[PDB]
Design a protein around this ligand. Structure first.
Ligand SMILES: [Cl-]
Ligand code: NA
Lengths: 412, 414
């Protein structure tokens, strides 16, 4: 029954072309510095938690600096937590005083400042928005938020649902063009299979306000009517390592998310950042399975992006400046992921991303199609290959030890 | 630190607009029946309800959007600016926010804007929408200088209602008709008697950019452009010029556009059948380009739905010229050499096109001193033009006294 508009369909293709975005988890939980789940993990009282807002002053926040650092990685979009499960709004809302402008001494709308910086730098802006809420007294309780001290575990769905829609209206009118709404929390009511999220009306609201905006919902199900992208939580499309999303794979654009260290919202214990090579491999492997990668940073309560995260972004971007052509604008490749790497493709080119190879030769199961040419992407040096009944065999100059040794094949 | 930050999409759209250079204005509304001008309502103090009765007689039976766009494309024009709703307040599109519109209130019963959008898309012509900030018909519209003798009950209007009505219609225009190249506002000057009048333009410009980031915003206020506008309009005058008395404002850094009429009026006028010559119209386009400006040349369609026959022929002959010389206009910016009495220059890449429009001599001095001129040829047949250097520039030696509409000399610079 859902009919995407032309503008929406163009947006979907642009999203797939862009390939690489940065997740930003920032909320009051950054003060506690123990994770965005702390409020329900530690059964904190909702009114006591809200007192934190009077001490929230991220004095070194600079939206220009954030977006410039994110652009330097080769990322093309940002997904920002406008309001997480804690229920604190990081924007100037007229529907709750529990927001960054009214309830903190900082008194600044960081979502507006980020929107302006994104326009300056040519970065698209996506909004994460929590379907669940551990703070509001009208929010129904599912699996989480049962020990916040609130009086009405049933909530008042008509009131809560209207509040959500009123806020979505603000986010889709007051902050310029928005590339996507990224919903989360559906899983909180999976104990109640008859729970009615009333998503057709809510998705219709979004597309009415901005037809080009993409709707995603992190529910781990076959996408519902009106969704424009499909999300896989730390699990890569056809895979369920973390146990969070081993679902089907569909006709909508795919996106998977990873953290750069161990955490989403800022954790002060967590200073083990993954290597630049590991991060580049996340991006390449995602692209190789026809999926975007959303890589998360958790900003500090002083308003700075972690120093090590900024440096890792910079080095990923140095790689992208050389190899971005093999990622941007591509779709998942003809040759499926293997232990040695993955392929992406664009036009008549198949990029063979050799990530983990022990040998000086590589068999590729390319049988039906003729490989017209094979070169080293970096310098266009020829790569010899032979044909056998099962495909082709690349003869490489050495055992590759590069982060990603890309061979560019021409196929017609 | 700037409130308004143009997106990459908008900045690209600005450069495409400047590349396209030539557009056609179309003023069409109920005033076409009276055939005395779009200002007739306020000039003759017509009652708003009496004027609205005209709509029951509006039936432009020969309207053919495909024929219009084809005739306009043949001129070399690359976009069209069409009056969706003029000061008379009559909506030329199917709108849910007023029944005073071409579908609901006339026997013609057709959304001509829809048909024009479809035809523009088919022929690859960009569509811009003119939209009036003032309204002589609605009872909630505030009155300024004009529309004070319409018989309406409330000179103060109800701005909250009227402004919400405008933004509802703008949403329709940007939702139901595909990609729109520009919104072209007009009427700010109606309230210049009230220095504190709040048009609430930031919110309205933001709505346009929110729904279509690549859509350009223009406002014919004759002022320094307000934040949020993407083009600057000069009415009936080259930028920097003021022969018509409507253009005393300074020239900004936004893309420039000047508008002109083919005859004397914007809306169709049955007395006014004195059409400027093809040569004059080509001179308008070339002089505009030489001043780093687009030209928007107007036609006022007839109440039977046809474009004036003489205007169509003029378009055709302008297009014959563009078929030969368009490379010297399209994709160019105002040239190194500023406009002179003899003509103007335009530039693109390593080429400076010297447009000789009015020269009585067989030679032409050009003040090109910093840059080296590698080569000079007659654009039309690539025949070499000899030139010499002097301390103040160069002197071209021409084969004859030029009498062409535009005798173009192509210089190669580096
Ligand atoms: Cl000069
Ligand atoms: Na269109």
């Amino acid at each position: 029954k859902y009919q995407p508009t032309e503008a929406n369909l163009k947006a979907r293709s642009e999203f797939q072309d862009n390939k690489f975005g940065i997740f930003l988890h920032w909320g009051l939980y950054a003060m506690l510095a123990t994770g965005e789940w702390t409020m329900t993990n530690n059964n904190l009282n909702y009114k006591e938690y809200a007192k934190l807002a009077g001490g929230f002053y991220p004095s070194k926040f600079d939206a220009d600096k954030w977006v410039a650092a994110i652009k330097a990685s080769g990322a093309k979009y940002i997904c920002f937590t406008t309001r997480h499960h804690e229920g604190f709004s990081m924007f100037d809302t007229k529907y709750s005083d529990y927001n960054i402008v009214k309830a903190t001494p900082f008194k600044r709308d960081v979502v507006k400042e980020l929107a302006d910086a994104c326009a300056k730098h040519g970065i698209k802006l996506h909004f994460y928005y929590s379907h669940i809420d551990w703070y509001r007294e009208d929010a129904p309780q599912g699996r989480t938020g049962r020990r916040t001290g609130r009086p009405n575990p049933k909530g008042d769905w008509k009131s809560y649902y209207q509040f959500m829609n009123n806020q979505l209206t603000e986010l889709l009118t007051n902050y310029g063009p928005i590339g996507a709404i990224w919903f989360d929390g559906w899983w909180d009511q999976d104990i109640n299979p008859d729970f009615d999220w009333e998503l057709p009306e809510q998705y219709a609201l979004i597309h009415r306000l901005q037809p080009a905006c993409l709707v995603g919902n992190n529910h781990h199900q076959t996408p519902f009517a009106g969704e424009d992208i499909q999300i896989f939580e730390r699990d890569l499309p056809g895979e369920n390592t973390a146990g969070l999303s081993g679902q089907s794979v569909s006709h909508l654009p795919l996106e998977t998310c990873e953290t750069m260290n161990g955490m989403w919202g800022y954790k002060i214990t967590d200073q083990n950042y993954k290597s630049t090579k590991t991060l580049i491999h996340y991006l390449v492997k995602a692209a190789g399975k026809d999926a975007n990668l959303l890589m998360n940073i958790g900003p500090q309560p002083d308003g700075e992006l972690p120093e090590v995260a900024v440096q890792r972004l910079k080095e990923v971007g140095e790689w992208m400046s050389k190899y971005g052509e093999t990622i941007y604008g591509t779709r998942g490749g003809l040759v499926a992921p293997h232990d040695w790497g993955v392929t992406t493709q664009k036009g008549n080119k198949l990029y063979v991303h050799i990530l983990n190879l022990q040998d000086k030769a590589l068999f590729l199961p390319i049988v039906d199609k003729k490989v017209k040419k094979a070169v080293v992407f970096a310098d266009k040096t020829p790569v010899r290959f032979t044909k056998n009944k099962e495909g082709i065999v690349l003869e490489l100059a050495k055992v590759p030890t590069d982060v990603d040794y890309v061979v560019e094949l021409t196929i017609d």
